[PDB]
Design a protein around this ligand. Structure first.
Ligand SMILES: [Cl-]
Ligand SMILES: [Cl-]
Ligand SMILES: [Cl-]
Ligand SMILES: [Cl-]
Ligand SMILES: [Mg+2]
Ligand SMILES: [Mg+2]
Ligand SMILES: [Mg+2]
Ligand SMILES: [Mg+2]
Lengths: 296, 295, 296, 295
């Protein structure tokens, strides 16, 4: 019908934006990363989201990235472009620009920082949803944006034809479960810590940060859960848990770029105010990656 | 030690029925305990928070425990709530429960006074040391104002009597790892997270909504454990309105009002807990009809 | 007609309950401490509050301590008895028993742990207020009790003739300022960190933990503020800040008992689940005490 | 460096007026700036959060700054908001503000992206290095999702250009000590805490309700400064309803609706911010009457 799993994917990486030594956009590496992540078992990628350092890249860079990633993997994976900011006008421009590039879908985070009221969020999300014909995910992350999309807002927004699901970092699994049951909105785990809980509650899949490093295992986790092998699912979730722990220490940006580098896929360093892992951080990260069998 | 056999898989955090005058009603407690077991609970927690442990005396708790043991103790596991924010008292209580023949203990993190982790460890250890009963830690920082930090849980794990955790902290990721590392059994201590906890390998539920929907929770546990997650998810959705009602009322007000709606009068809460208002009963009745446990 | 400052005091210690070596109630030491604290500048004391280890003492012990304290200082200081638990009927017995002993007022904390609704709190505080003729203070401390006394509940309760004030640890200075203006409820700073901001907002004084160690400076701080010398008040508040920092590390019970010992006033150790300071914690506290000029 | 003289004692976190079509309205900005200075503000912050920094372009912010400098720069201190969650952008914006002749910078903690403390420090250092302007840190974790931790503020205090903090974090105890240790100036960034901040030695207010009640906030600062705390307390009570309306509406909706109610139309917010509904206007009007800033 709208087949969210087919149209958006089941395992997506909230993909980093590789930068060169010169700190500029590195689209060739983005292509290589995108290919690698899909080969490792991702069937979708979110480009220019939070972990893609959307705050510090320009509109132009976001479009160049999306173009490169679509060229690299667009015929065999779903490419979802991060398109929202705390500026409704800007989000609509970016959304239209992403659609014009051929993005397969949009991920639109709750306007952050400015704490609009729920009716402002709701007018914001529908305006963005009205801007293109692309399927759109809400990204509910009050821990970064400083306001939740309240359940009544999510429910009101669900009736928008273009708004098809929720990337959740709010962790209200009880509320999201009901929302799903009532509205048919698809949910993606937006927090690797809750990947397995979310699947139990009927999430469609993951939009994952630790997928940068452990996509193969996450794919296996999805396959095991999917075939009702919960014991295995649980065991894989435990196996990757050190990466999620490392993520708590470093955040996704620092972790993803340092961890990829450790795996021999240099994707450069974060842009200020984000920072590259320190020596000791790289150390501790390497031990977790070893523990999760994603580094020798 | 078989946690599922010894403690159960579906337990109600059972109310303590009071008479019209406010006094302990053990006859109704027996009748309730029988009902809850017949509906599908294989264990009960008596004199926990939902059992209004704050407002009942030691004597009342013991009276109730004996009544419930006598009623269902041959056919279900009866775990007694035994800790407060007072180690000496908790010890006394745990001992009094063991002397009555309680099958296990549920020991909440000391509330209010916010001891440091080493105080918590010394406290749980002292309680664990006081009887030979299996003991669950009850981690509910939202009530107690301090968590049992994962290191503290792990240190406690190696106490022979400390066999698991009733979790209301919702740190599913951390609980999962603790389980994997220590073999501590986890019980969902918050109905909202029943299904997520099962996914993470919880042993079962120590439930409030079980007062009203034990049969469905049992079906949820069986569907889940048989490998039928889609049916488990459906059942979870079916009972959600009860968890919603619980967010509005709290477990004590909900459980007493809902049982009354079901025709099992268990009296009213003791101050500072309060009986549902007429409006609340009506809204509660709507959720209960929605959950197919009334009318 | 009720003069809160005269009836309840301006500088109170949330006084520890001294225990002997065997853990038993030490009333002779309580009497010595009560005298010391009054001599140092407190004009009132709260007995059997949280810092007095109300969770771990019996009713009998509370009554015995109250008597010892009234006897020691009740002729020249106000003696306020902690009477609230999460059990209304118990709080009533306690309140009555304290009234019968001659307590000058009651401090009644929000029922903890069980999270009654606001109407439950209202019925609870009312029932306790109805139990005796004593003036009564609400102790709003959601950080321990797990529920606030909401402003509407406080306002409702202000309408009781026996409820005369609030010991605040909620830090809603804006709300408390308005409550005071609207209701004439007196406020006492219940968290030493906010003593000075609370005075700015019209608090009557402090019900203090660090007063165990620094009553004289707190007295000076009240006097400086009262005479409008805010610069001096701010200076003193800075001088005693290390004690407030130590309190963050140790909690009040541990800090008060270890600190008094350091000062040559041994008041024994806390009862489990509270714990005595470790030698390291004692060293760190001594450094803070010296900085605050309340230890050689 | 005289912070009071160089940055002011009473500043409004000023709205950015938009025309009917949503476009920047610099004439009304100039109008508004003159009005606020005349009412008692001795500085203004332009293109802060209340100034809708999220929804205005760089060009608009510069145009507005230029107009506000022309309007009141000779008689008031005009502080330009210059921080975002992008360090290179913040640097551009700071430079651009300095080139316009801004008297100082207000730089908010990078929001949303939750950089670590060392990222914050490198960020605020890079922005502080970018111009010769005095700079205020704006610590508001309730919006930015990370605090500037005390150690970070203390490390930053040593930067010659970093001269103070606009606080919305409400850690009065910590700011008090930071002030004592570093000489950093503090401004109350949350009207609720204006009076408590003065007690702790804040230099003044960077205020939202100053849009409506600058004159009373001025009377407050003066009463406090001369040692008449009783009067300061009374004034703070008198304007409290404005702070309460702010809790209902947020500063942007409140400021633009309230100014309109006063007869200074500054248009409507840009999405995702929203204009007050009719009921909200009524309820706001009632508070403004209570605060004697509306007939
Ligand atoms: Cl939700
Ligand atoms: Cl944990
Ligand atoms: Cl309040
Ligand atoms: Cl701070
Ligand atoms: Mg839809
Ligand atoms: Mg064990
Ligand atoms: Mg009164
Ligand atoms: Mg400096």
């Amino acid at each position: 019908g709208f087949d969210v799993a087919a149209r958006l994917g089941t395992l997506l990486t909230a993909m980093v934006t590789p930068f060169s030594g010169d700190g500029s956009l590195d689209t060739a590496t983005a292509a290589r990363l995108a290919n690698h992540l899909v080969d490792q078992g991702c069937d979708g990628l979110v480009v220019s989201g939070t972990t893609g350092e959307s705050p510090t890249t320009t509109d132009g860079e976001k479009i160049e990235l999306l173009r490169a990633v679509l060229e690299a993997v667009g015929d065999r994976a779903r490419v979802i472009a991060g398109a929202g900011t705390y500026d409704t006008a800007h989000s609509i421009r970016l959304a239209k620009a992403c659609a014009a590039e051929g993005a397969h879908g949009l991920l639109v985070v709750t306007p952050y920082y400015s704490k609009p009221p729920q009716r402002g969020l709701q007018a914001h999300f529908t305006a963005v949803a009205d801007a293109t014909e692309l399927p759109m995910l809400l990204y509910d992350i009050p821990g970064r944006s400083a306001v939740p999309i309240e359940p009544d807002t999510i429910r009101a927004l669900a009736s928008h034809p273009n708004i098809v699901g929720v990337k959740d970092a709010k962790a209200d699994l009880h509320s999201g479960a009901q929302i799903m049951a009532d509205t048919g909105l698809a949910y993606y785990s937006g927090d690797d810590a809750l990947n397995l809980p979310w699947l139990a509650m009927g999430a469609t899949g993951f939009i994952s940060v630790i997928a940068h490093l452990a996509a193969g295992q996450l794919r296996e986790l999805l396959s095991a859960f999917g075939s009702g092998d919960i014991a295995t699912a649980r065991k894989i979730n435990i196996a990757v848990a050190p990466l999620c722990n490392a993520m708590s220490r470093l955040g996704g940006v620092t972790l993803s770029k340092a961890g990829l580098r450790l795996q021999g896929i240099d994707v450069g360093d974060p842009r200020l105010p984000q920072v590259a892992a320190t020596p000791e951080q790289i150390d501790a990260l390497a031990a977790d990656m070893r523990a999760a069998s994603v580094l020798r």
